[PDB]
């Protein structure tokens, strides 16, 4: 229309985009900064970066962009693109990405009385600190530091508005708790400029259904089969075969885990200790099995038990586990044959109790290793704080 | 020509690209928005993004870009590049990508009467929600939210036209069902501006031939060999060897699966339950085999059956499975030799029935584990909705 | 020089880059479009994109960029950068990449009589259809659709010139066959504008030496060792050990293959069927071995053969394979000892023929499984079209 | 305000951004360059690049950007964007990235007396030299070369200020030691221009808790089980089974290691030697086991010991390890039976000492291989310099 | 200063950046092109691209950028940014990257007499041909084609200067040999324009310490253990177990190798043949072991040797390897017992020589397979040209 064309001509008349729109060059310009979280794109522990899709709202007041409604009746608001009107230089301080702005400058709405609002969308990649302790059951606090880069305390008075979460599109992996904020001003090394800033911190809780079922559940089941060695009879030459196959089949899990675990020397993660515990329990099973096996094939008539094994593994431990354990030359020739058989029976009896001792050790170690696994798995998981709420929410 | 050069000079005379081309600054400008799907580039479940190659069509009416055909006979249409004429700021609301526009501004056609049409091509990366439940047999609905960013209800009246699918170049992985749309206007927190938008939703069905043959078919075959342990004789020291090798060879499948499965704690995927079922069936086979093995090498003369095994596994279960099961000193020396052989026969007979009990258990568990696998594999697959149509289309 | 400086001043005088350089605004401008293939960067089956490094040649005639050689003797040609003279908007229709142009605008040569030629280099990422059937022995046809975006039939008459392949730098993986082209014009949904285009199709043949030697050759060799189970004696408790280790060692190949195979449900690839055939042949070997093993450790005196096995595996199949298969009490005590030995001999004879039956089955299955593998491997490879030429070229 | 609008108009009056702001064109312009390290993004050994998030500070003095405070009372400082005032062209010399600047030009503060300061933020990817020797316990020195590109010694006198580390946000993987710097000027091949530069070197120490626990600790434990072969009795046919399974299960570690190790032929890394030592120790265990096994199943009555084994492995080594090791025809028939049994006893005795020799070798090799592993693991780790401080800090 | 401000004003007066700075428009402009290699970023065989960080030097003479030193005493040189003075359009012809220039336009130095020099830094990604034959011991020649894009022979006379390598920062993986160059002009299809160019070829030698130690050394060691099967006694049921475990553990190496090997069907790489040789040697070991095993468990009394084995493996091969290899009824009952034992001895003797034949074959195959491995490993490595220099440099 003729009024819109006319109004745009006075508005850009003698206008300098490099100038603060303050009427008096002695008072700071009040700028209201807010934030709207639309979704959490991804949280990557390896690079310790946080990708979020958010909206920004910068609102200030202009003095030269004012006009009377009566003179121009039809038009009420005007829009100016980037590079034609003064805008605040508020930007993310972290900005862990190649290009540092990440704001996608759009049109800037202008009031009928000079109140200018700016609503740019962008995808931000901030530098967060992923404290990976109690990894499946961890809560992360990520900060977003926003503030002006060239305007100090007396030039741009940065104010704060509460963050908006109307429309969040939940990720499904991380459960958002809340996004509080804070406004403060600090003194930097360069200058005597007190620089205000707005720091929005994001608190999110990691869901545990995927990690618990795909990682924690198989570990208990695989470790259970390593406990099944003591139930196999020693006759079947198969004890070490299943003893070492489970160990080989269980080292593969940290290969997946280490691909996700950041290589940070802050603290030993809970998942790292739990896997390490399974290494030792399965590893010590093979060592015990070797001791059991040599008790079976002891090659008798080559050394008797030192009389401590006859009383420990056959009287004390056994009670606990309810084991309950021309004719003259013809005669001489037959004499040797029967005596040889008699000596074979004596050797068999000596070897028989050697095998029974191995059975006692196997059964004794089964009870000892079983209670170790029960308290090791439970004890580590119980130690994690807020473990109960995650189970009560994700699982139950 | 001289007419084209002349016409371009009046057209750009006193023209402001920042002004809405409405003749009266009281009525909204009617803008027709449509869409044309050219192909689906890729659907990624891990990042929950949808990459599509589409075309856009924005058509509106201009008031200052009008001329008489008689005055300029040769020229009928003119084209203006970006930044020289007013264009709507319609953009994708989701825009899950670094740069937010993704439109590749091109020349804008102009009528002889002021009807301006704009047809920019681009590759869009929207943020979709991949509900991964019944993963091989899932249907995904992806939304595309388009609308103006700075013009409200009274400024830009956004209209809708039906989506165009003339030329789709089918992906081969996802089967397109349809792309319906909707026009609505909502109230936002910033302003009293009712903002219209056009939301095009894309419904696609995942094809199952690749996932069924490369993932589902081998799982049945590998689980079948784990069922073959009960057919192996216990004499060959090879039962646990094949019992645990199949288990080791079958854990590798979720390694491929987890690399594709998004780590979302929304619901347990169908493929996750089916793999978990195979874990337990194969895992319980090793536990049963250990019980069977200790029934074989029972070391007789160390405890008889409690008289419940003589009647259960030898009379009840066996009937079900059709098993059907100087001279005086010379005489004394020969007396011991024959008696020793007689005692060996008695011990062999006792051990013989111990081995037969193990054979009954093996055969009994073969029948029980077979029907479990048949109903577990079928039962999980039947539970998925629209399973029949995918088989009737992709396979048959 | 003074003439070059003077000439540039009249040339840009009253020049509008938005105007078609036609002298009469009623006839289309003839634009000659060609192509020069410099190399094929990469063909990716997963994303179905084709990356090529090519050159473009757009040549048209300008009316305002003309001058007399006599007036300016030294200068014969002039060059204008992008944004200063009118250029056609020909662009790739597919453009499967983030930015859509991929042309790297350079200087544009200008004749002494107005004939303007434009030779921009670029790397193009078109969207091809990789029909992966007979994957090692496949020929792919990739199209490149070029045409104007804003100028119709009556505005820009797009012509065609033959593609140039002078200098190709062969890739070494794909063998180029030829690059023919076509010029046609179609009617689109938007407008009554008949839009001409030039479609250059690229035909390339995949070389087979790498895929044949690294993938096809090991498969035959590994499957051969799975056939070696029937030659192992049943006494050595090692038949299932090598039966299942080969199967475990052979599942790893599709892990490499599936990483290359696109997940397209168009048709079952030849390499997929060939691997699936090896699964069944190796898988059925373990099933046969279990049947053979239970024929060995049959535990005699627990059931005789049903008299069909005595005649089938011992008379019919065996002929085919050339198998050819006080004193009174002293006497009574010795009577039992000899009779016990006699009964042992009878039991050994019964078990002896049980073992021989297992040997016959093993040898019989070796002949049957051998011919199956020979015709399965050859039969699948022969079915692929143009298999002979690839072997005659890549190998021989 | 009116004063800010007025001041900006004289400041940009007759101003050339291509001109050095020196009042006299005979003296170099003094530019103060500093640096502020905010965090270390990532150190990648494969590409030998160092990604850091740092801030820059370039401060110089301008002669034309001066004004009187009395004339313009309200305004004290002004800001000019890029491309409107002269700025130094200081840039990173290494710049191992696609775009070479990586500075994100921002507003430039201006004094009331002409002192201009410039504080651009950016993420820099310099080309470092990762000397990977003693890899878990290494200290890296990375250089950052900054200097002007077009201004020589007499044009831009580049000065140096101490680096700032107020706020570092420690990475958790690398421990920062310090960031010293240096200012020097060199003569280049192009010109007689002495070019000053500022080289900031970054010294960081890699933390060892993650690499020690996830890589070094399992290696000792896995190598311990390879040492357990000599404790297994030779009767259980399981020595090679555990001998070769550990070797198969231990080759997988360099697969993870080689994925991290850069392929640089500078020196053999400490982790490479330590893994290579474990290869030989585990590998030689299988060779020894084969020698031990053939001493067990020696098939007696086929060769006696050469009388050196009777004295070495049975008298010398055994003492070290405390081993301590009608009637006539009736008579003739019984004569053979007893003599046959007597010959069996003699053969058993000969085979008995053959088995005992294998037991001595097994035990002897257990002592020899144990001390080898203890000194090989400790000896390699001790050789690394500053090994003690890393253990005293990261672990203790 | 006032002189610098004044000089810049005449210099840009009536200056056209589109014009060649030649005083006479009949002679070509002499442009000197050189190169400085700073480092080799990476050489990637899969994509056949070469990433290098180099500097360029373009020097020409300008006619309009001249001034008298006396008139302007202080200033001696001036700098003009991109887009304000004429510059040559020399660019890399290969440019295997998204953006085609890769030059990072900087300030351009100007003499006091018109000699203009241009020194832009950049990271170039050229398209090289990696002839992967004798892969660990290969030398690659990579070309860099530089030349003008729009100026022909009579317009821009491109000259050449020797490449500079003062400061190379050796990569550590590739050993630079030299960078020679060449200047030539060719006739293209478009035009009668003879286009000069400068082609700098880079010759680099790959270092072998990393590839030799991490890949070649383990292959010899793993193949050695596959040769240890023939030393294992056949009694221990463990020959196939170690025979097939080594084969399973050795297929994993090409998985790493194929991830590095480009899929080019040019020639069979040396590393491919060496791995293929190890496949057959290890593979044939299992086949021989099966033949040996069936010679052990021959089940005697079921066929004698054909009298060729008695003379070949027991007389010829054995000599080579130094093997050296009421009363009447009482009497009748004892008669059978002794005769049964006598028949057992005869059967044992027949089986004894069957086992000895297997021992001869095992030992005979050990000698034959050992010399095969020695000449196969050495023979392949010796065939590679310049193998000796790499060992003499990288290793010794
Ligand atoms: O209403 C809005 N944005 C709409 C206006 N335009 C049209 C649709 C929407 C996006 C652009 C709002 C955006 C933000 C951002 C940060 C903080 C707050 Cl409190 C708000 S409220
Ligand atoms: O001759 C040429 N290009 C040269 C001219 N300049 C200098 C060297 C070369 C590149 C730039 C040609 C380029 C093309 C492109 C497409 C089709 C055809 Cl038939 C041709 S012929
Ligand atoms: O001297 C130089 N470059 C310095 C000048 N400026 C300041 C420091 C350096 C980089 C910019 C040189 C650069 C090149 C490039 C190619 C060939 C040659 Cl023979 C040379 S000589």
List keywords for this structure.
homopentamer; toxic substance binding (chains A, B, C, D, E); 7-stranded mixed sheet; 5-stranded antiparallel sheet; ligand-gated ion channel (chains A, B, C, D, E); amyloid-beta binding (chains A, B, C, D, E); Acetylcholine Binding Protein, Chain: A; 8 helices; disulfide bond (chains A, B, C, D, E); alpha+beta; 396 residues; ion channel (chains A, B, C, D, E); binds 7-chloro-N-(quinuclidin-3-yl)benzo[b]thiophene-2-carboxamide
Describe the structure.
The PDB classes it as membrane protein. Keywords: alpha 7, nicotinic acetylcholine receptor, apo-form, membrane protein. It forms a pentameric assembly. The entry is titled "human alpha 7 nicotinic acetylcholine receptor bound to EVP-6124". Chains A, B, C, D, E: Neuronal acetylcholine receptor subunit alpha-7. Organism of A, B, C, D, E: Homo sapiens. The structure is a homopentamer of 396-residue chains. With 396 residues, chain A is an alpha+beta fold. Chain A has a domain at 2-209: Distorted Sandwich (Acetylcholine Binding Protein, Chain: A). In chain A, 39% of the residues lie in helices and 22% in strands. Chain A contains 8 helices and 12 strands. The first copy, chain A, has helices spanning 2-11, 209-226, 239-250, 252-260, 270-296, 309-320, 327-383, 387-395; strands at 29-44, 49-61, 78-80, 90-92, 108-110, 115-118, 121-127, 139-148, 156-160, 174-178, 181-187, 194-206. In chain A, the strands form 2 sheets. In chain A, strands 1, 2, 3, 5, 6, 7 and 9 form a 7-stranded mixed sheet that branches. In chain A, strands 4, 8, 10, 11 and 12 form a 5-stranded antiparallel sheet that branches. In chain A, a hairpin with a 6-residue loop joins strand 11 (181-187) and strand 12. In chain A, helix 2 (209-226) packs antiparallel against helix 3, helix 3 (239-250) packs antiparallel against helix 5 and helix 6 packs across helix 7 (327-383). The longest helix of chain A has 57 residues, at 327-383. Chain A is rod-shaped. Chains C and E meet through helix 1, strand 1, strand 3, strand 7 and helix 2 of C and helix 3, helix 4, helix 5 and helix 7 of E. Bound molecules: 7-chloro-N-(quinuclidin-3-yl)benzo[b]thiophene-2-carboxamide (I33) (3 copies). One 7-chloro-N-(quinuclidin-3-yl)benzo[b]thiophene-2-carboxamide sits between chains E (34-36, 55-57, 119, 164) and D (149, 188-190, 195).
């Amino acid at each position: 229309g003729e009024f819109q064309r006319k109004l745009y001509k006075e508005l850009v008349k003698n206008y300098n985009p490099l100038e603060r729109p303050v009427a008096n060059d002695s008072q700071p310009l009040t700028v209201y900064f807010s934030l709207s979280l639309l979704q959490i794109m991804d949280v990557d522990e390896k690079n310790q970066v946080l990708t979020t899709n958010i909206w920004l709202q910068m609102s200030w007041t202009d003095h030269y962009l004012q006009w009377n409604v009566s003179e121009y009746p039809g038009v009420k608001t005007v829009r100016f693109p980037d590079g034609q009107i003064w805008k605040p230089d508020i930007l993310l301080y972290n900005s862990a990405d190649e290009r540092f702005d990440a704001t996608f400058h759009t049109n800037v709405l202008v009031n009928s009385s000079g109140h200018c609002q700016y609503l740019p969308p962008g995808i931000f990649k901030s530098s967060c600190y992923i404290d990976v302790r109690w990894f499946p059951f961890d809560v992360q606090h990520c900060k977003l530091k926003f503030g002006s880069w060239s305007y100090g305390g007396w030039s741009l008075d940065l104010q704060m508005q509460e963050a908006d979460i109307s429309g969040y599109i939940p990720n499904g992996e991380w459960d958002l708790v809340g996004i509080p904020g804070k406004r403060s001003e600090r003194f930097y090394e360069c200058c005597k400029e007190p620089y205000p800033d707005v720091t929005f911190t994001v608190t999110m809780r990691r869901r545990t259904l995927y990690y618990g079922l795909n990682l924690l559940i198989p570990c208990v089941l695989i470790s259970a089969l390593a406990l099944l060695v003591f139930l196999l009879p020693a006759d079947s030459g198969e004890k070490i075969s299943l003893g070492i196959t489970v160990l080989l089949s269980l080292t593969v899990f940290m290969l997946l885990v280490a691909e996700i675990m950041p290589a940070t020397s802050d603290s030993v993660p809970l998942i790292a200790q739990y896997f390490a515990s399974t290494m030792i329990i399965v590893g010590l099973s093979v060592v015990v099995t070797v001791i059991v096996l040599q008790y079976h094939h002891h090659d008798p008539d080559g050394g008797k038990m030192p009389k401590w094994t006859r009383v420990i593994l056959l009287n004390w431990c056994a009670w606990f586990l309810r084991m309950k354990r021309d004719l003259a030359k013809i005669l001489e020739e037959v004499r040797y044959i029967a005596n040889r058989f008699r000596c074979q029976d004596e050797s068999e009896a000596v070897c028989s109790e050697w095998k029974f001792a191995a059975c006692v050790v196997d059964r004794l170690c089964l009870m000892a290793f079983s209670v170790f696994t029960i308290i090791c798995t439970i004890g580590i998981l119980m130690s994690a704080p807020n473990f109960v709420e995650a189970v009560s929410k994700d699982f139950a």
